């Protein structure tokens, strides 16, 4: 089973990236399983809703009392050295919140890092049905 672990917010960066102080050291984390419109896309820069998704994540982790990280079952860092995890703010998963508001799409999933895929798929469908932001 996965397990949550404490961390401290250092700075939110994008709708899908946040810098945290994990185990004594600063680390950039990429939110598992979600794709958020980008503000600093490597080729396009600011896409539609990017500012909205960035403000949403920033708002959520910044207003929290307790941040926790939950690594999945496979690799824990991507090629750029960013931790791959599910981030929770006061018990609520930032990854899911983003998808539920239609501020992110569920990304291309790759086992064994797919534990919450079903859950995330369920929130994205609901957001599509409600025609929210990205699904409007």
PDB file of C-alpha atoms in Angstrom:
ATOM      1  CA  UNK A   1       0.000   0.000   0.000  1.00  0.00           C
ATOM      2  CA  UNK A   2       1.068   3.599  -0.572  1.00  0.00           C
ATOM      3  CA  UNK A   3       1.603   5.901   2.371  1.00  0.00           C
ATOM      4  CA  UNK A   4       1.482   9.609   2.797  1.00  0.00           C
ATOM      5  CA  UNK A   5       4.555  11.475   4.010  1.00  0.00           C
ATOM      6  CA  UNK A   6       4.993  15.023   5.343  1.00  0.00           C
ATOM      7  CA  UNK A   7       6.530  17.869   3.330  1.00  0.00           C
ATOM      8  CA  UNK A   8       6.662  21.640   3.514  1.00  0.00           C
ATOM      9  CA  UNK A   9       5.644  24.057   0.791  1.00  0.00           C
ATOM     10  CA  UNK A  10       8.488  26.088  -0.603  1.00  0.00           C
ATOM     11  CA  UNK A  11       6.911  27.589  -3.712  1.00  0.00           C
ATOM     12  CA  UNK A  12       4.201  26.682  -6.227  1.00  0.00           C
ATOM     13  CA  UNK A  13       5.492  26.840  -9.772  1.00  0.00           C
ATOM     14  CA  UNK A  14       2.927  25.749 -12.327  1.00  0.00           C
ATOM     15  CA  UNK A  15      -0.505  24.156 -12.173  1.00  0.00           C
ATOM     16  CA  UNK A  16       1.311  20.788 -12.260  1.00  0.00           C
ATOM     17  CA  UNK A  17       4.544  21.539 -10.396  1.00  0.00           C
ATOM     18  CA  UNK A  18       5.326  22.568  -6.839  1.00  0.00           C
ATOM     19  CA  UNK A  19       8.643  22.876  -4.995  1.00  0.00           C
ATOM     20  CA  UNK A  20       8.667  21.190  -1.573  1.00  0.00           C
ATOM     21  CA  UNK A  21      11.046  20.508   1.301  1.00  0.00           C
ATOM     22  CA  UNK A  22      10.975  16.737   1.523  1.00  0.00           C
ATOM     23  CA  UNK A  23      13.232  14.864   4.003  1.00  0.00           C
ATOM     24  CA  UNK A  24      15.367  17.913   4.646  1.00  0.00           C
ATOM     25  CA  UNK A  25      15.934  18.767   1.012  1.00  0.00           C
ATOM     26  CA  UNK A  26      14.207  21.051  -1.530  1.00  0.00           C
ATOM     27  CA  UNK A  27      12.689  19.117  -4.411  1.00  0.00           C
ATOM     28  CA  UNK A  28      10.564  19.854  -7.420  1.00  0.00           C
ATOM     29  CA  UNK A  29       7.487  17.642  -7.628  1.00  0.00           C
ATOM     30  CA  UNK A  30       5.440  16.962 -10.727  1.00  0.00           C
ATOM     31  CA  UNK A  31       1.819  15.981 -10.002  1.00  0.00           C
ATOM     32  CA  UNK A  32       1.218  12.377 -11.039  1.00  0.00           C
ATOM     33  CA  UNK A  33      -1.333  11.446 -13.702  1.00  0.00           C
ATOM     34  CA  UNK A  34      -2.471  14.928 -14.696  1.00  0.00           C
ATOM     35  CA  UNK A  35      -1.840  17.354 -17.509  1.00  0.00           C
ATOM     36  CA  UNK A  36      -2.566  21.019 -16.802  1.00  0.00           C
ATOM     37  CA  UNK A  37      -2.635  23.781 -19.434  1.00  0.00           C
ATOM     38  CA  UNK A  38       0.778  25.417 -19.257  1.00  0.00           C
ATOM     39  CA  UNK A  39       1.885  28.904 -18.352  1.00  0.00           C
ATOM     40  CA  UNK A  40       5.534  28.115 -19.188  1.00  0.00           C
ATOM     41  CA  UNK A  41       5.172  25.447 -21.868  1.00  0.00           C
ATOM     42  CA  UNK A  42       8.592  24.539 -23.401  1.00  0.00           C
ATOM     43  CA  UNK A  43       7.261  25.511 -26.841  1.00  0.00           C
ATOM     44  CA  UNK A  44       3.998  27.460 -26.393  1.00  0.00           C
ATOM     45  CA  UNK A  45       4.225  29.309 -23.076  1.00  0.00           C
ATOM     46  CA  UNK A  46       0.773  30.298 -21.752  1.00  0.00           C
ATOM     47  CA  UNK A  47      -2.161  28.166 -22.958  1.00  0.00           C
ATOM     48  CA  UNK A  48      -5.839  28.747 -22.182  1.00  0.00           C
ATOM     49  CA  UNK A  49      -6.653  28.021 -18.518  1.00  0.00           C
ATOM     50  CA  UNK A  50      -2.960  27.717 -17.671  1.00  0.00           C
ATOM     51  CA  UNK A  51      -3.158  30.840 -15.415  1.00  0.00           C
ATOM     52  CA  UNK A  52      -6.347  29.412 -13.887  1.00  0.00           C
ATOM     53  CA  UNK A  53      -4.794  25.982 -13.134  1.00  0.00           C
ATOM     54  CA  UNK A  54      -1.643  27.624 -11.718  1.00  0.00           C
ATOM     55  CA  UNK A  55      -3.699  29.908  -9.465  1.00  0.00           C
ATOM     56  CA  UNK A  56      -5.835  26.950  -8.343  1.00  0.00           C
ATOM     57  CA  UNK A  57      -2.853  24.737  -7.268  1.00  0.00           C
ATOM     58  CA  UNK A  58      -1.026  27.723  -5.734  1.00  0.00           C
ATOM     59  CA  UNK A  59      -4.162  28.665  -3.808  1.00  0.00           C
ATOM     60  CA  UNK A  60      -4.701  25.106  -2.524  1.00  0.00           C
ATOM     61  CA  UNK A  61      -1.214  24.291  -1.225  1.00  0.00           C
ATOM     62  CA  UNK A  62      -0.593  27.815   0.029  1.00  0.00           C
ATOM     63  CA  UNK A  63      -3.702  27.912   2.172  1.00  0.00           C
ATOM     64  CA  UNK A  64      -3.034  24.462   3.716  1.00  0.00           C
ATOM     65  CA  UNK A  65      -2.067  23.553   7.260  1.00  0.00           C
ATOM     66  CA  UNK A  66      -0.504  20.252   6.270  1.00  0.00           C
ATOM     67  CA  UNK A  67       1.025  19.066   2.993  1.00  0.00           C
ATOM     68  CA  UNK A  68       1.743  15.361   2.389  1.00  0.00           C
ATOM     69  CA  UNK A  69       3.279  13.474  -0.500  1.00  0.00           C
ATOM     70  CA  UNK A  70       2.339  10.055  -1.717  1.00  0.00           C
ATOM     71  CA  UNK A  71       4.697   8.271  -4.139  1.00  0.00           C
ATOM     72  CA  UNK A  72       3.189   5.559  -6.301  1.00  0.00           C
ATOM     73  CA  UNK A  73       4.552   2.009  -6.943  1.00  0.00           C
ATOM     74  CA  UNK A  74       7.072   2.533  -9.816  1.00  0.00           C
ATOM     75  CA  UNK A  75       9.778   5.154 -10.323  1.00  0.00           C
ATOM     76  CA  UNK A  76       9.725   8.131  -7.999  1.00  0.00           C
ATOM     77  CA  UNK A  77      11.525  10.750 -10.098  1.00  0.00           C
ATOM     78  CA  UNK A  78      11.216  11.562 -13.820  1.00  0.00           C
ATOM     79  CA  UNK A  79      14.119  12.247 -16.202  1.00  0.00           C
ATOM     80  CA  UNK A  80      14.497  15.867 -15.051  1.00  0.00           C
ATOM     81  CA  UNK A  81      14.816  14.813 -11.436  1.00  0.00           C
ATOM     82  CA  UNK A  82      11.296  15.854 -10.383  1.00  0.00           C
ATOM     83  CA  UNK A  83       9.540  13.724  -7.774  1.00  0.00           C
ATOM     84  CA  UNK A  84       6.435  11.913  -9.138  1.00  0.00           C
ATOM     85  CA  UNK A  85       3.697  11.882  -6.537  1.00  0.00           C
ATOM     86  CA  UNK A  86       0.170  12.556  -5.438  1.00  0.00           C
ATOM     87  CA  UNK A  87       0.109  15.738  -3.331  1.00  0.00           C
ATOM     88  CA  UNK A  88      -2.495  16.191  -0.579  1.00  0.00           C
ATOM     89  CA  UNK A  89      -3.433  19.532   1.091  1.00  0.00           C
ATOM     90  CA  UNK A  90      -5.234  19.008   4.421  1.00  0.00           C
ATOM     91  CA  UNK A  91      -6.286  15.571   3.325  1.00  0.00           C
ATOM     92  CA  UNK A  92      -7.487  16.595  -0.134  1.00  0.00           C
ATOM     93  CA  UNK A  93      -5.625  15.419  -3.253  1.00  0.00           C
ATOM     94  CA  UNK A  94      -4.497  18.321  -5.399  1.00  0.00           C
ATOM     95  CA  UNK A  95      -4.214  16.029  -8.437  1.00  0.00           C
ATOM     96  CA  UNK A  96      -7.928  15.080  -8.252  1.00  0.00           C
ATOM     97  CA  UNK A  97      -9.192  18.585  -7.331  1.00  0.00           C
ATOM     98  CA  UNK A  98      -7.558  19.920 -10.504  1.00  0.00           C
ATOM     99  CA  UNK A  99      -9.203  17.285 -12.702  1.00  0.00           C
ATOM    100  CA  UNK A 100     -12.617  17.644 -10.954  1.00  0.00           C
ATOM    101  CA  UNK A 101     -12.747  21.390 -11.788  1.00  0.00           C
ATOM    102  CA  UNK A 102     -11.830  20.707 -15.390  1.00  0.00           C
ATOM    103  CA  UNK A 103      -8.484  22.409 -14.804  1.00  0.00           C
ATOM    104  CA  UNK A 104      -6.535  19.320 -15.924  1.00  0.00           C
ATOM    105  CA  UNK A 105      -6.848  16.221 -18.115  1.00  0.00           C
ATOM    106  CA  UNK A 106      -5.799  12.742 -17.009  1.00  0.00           C
ATOM    107  CA  UNK A 107      -2.401  12.100 -18.639  1.00  0.00           C
ATOM    108  CA  UNK A 108      -1.040   9.099 -20.538  1.00  0.00           C
ATOM    109  CA  UNK A 109      -0.772   6.505 -17.764  1.00  0.00           C
ATOM    110  CA  UNK A 110       2.117   4.044 -17.410  1.00  0.00           C
ATOM    111  CA  UNK A 111       2.162   1.130 -14.959  1.00  0.00           C
ATOM    112  CA  UNK A 112       3.164   0.660 -12.280  1.00  0.00           C
ATOM    113  CA  UNK A 113       2.485   4.393 -11.551  1.00  0.00           C
ATOM    114  CA  UNK A 114      -1.302   4.162 -12.032  1.00  0.00           C
ATOM    115  CA  UNK A 115      -2.870   3.527  -8.625  1.00  0.00           C
ATOM    116  CA  UNK A 116      -5.355   6.414  -8.687  1.00  0.00           C
ATOM    117  CA  UNK A 117      -6.072   6.323 -12.420  1.00  0.00           C
ATOM    118  CA  UNK A 118      -9.590   4.978 -11.915  1.00  0.00           C
ATOM    119  CA  UNK A 119     -10.402   7.614  -9.314  1.00  0.00           C
ATOM    120  CA  UNK A 120      -9.006  10.407 -11.508  1.00  0.00           C
ATOM    121  CA  UNK A 121     -10.829   9.063 -14.561  1.00  0.00           C
ATOM    122  CA  UNK A 122     -14.059   9.267 -12.586  1.00  0.00           C
ATOM    123  CA  UNK A 123     -13.594  12.936 -11.641  1.00  0.00           C
ATOM    124  CA  UNK A 124     -12.598  13.941 -15.187  1.00  0.00           C
ATOM    125  CA  UNK A 125     -15.767  12.375 -16.599  1.00  0.00           C
ATOM    126  CA  UNK A 126     -17.863  14.294 -14.071  1.00  0.00           C
ATOM    127  CA  UNK A 127     -16.135  17.559 -15.069  1.00  0.00           C
ATOM    128  CA  UNK A 128     -16.748  16.788 -18.760  1.00  0.00           C
ATOM    129  CA  UNK A 129     -20.416  16.173 -18.064  1.00  0.00           C
ATOM    130  CA  UNK A 130     -20.587  19.508 -16.263  1.00  0.00           C
ATOM    131  CA  UNK A 131     -18.825  21.259 -19.179  1.00  0.00           C
ATOM    132  CA  UNK A 132     -16.295  22.882 -16.835  1.00  0.00           C
ATOM    133  CA  UNK A 133     -13.487  25.125 -18.111  1.00  0.00           C
ATOM    134  CA  UNK A 134     -11.421  22.794 -20.270  1.00  0.00           C
ATOM    135  CA  UNK A 135     -14.553  20.815 -21.171  1.00  0.00           C
ATOM    136  CA  UNK A 136     -16.638  23.752 -22.359  1.00  0.00           C
TER     137      UNK A 136
END
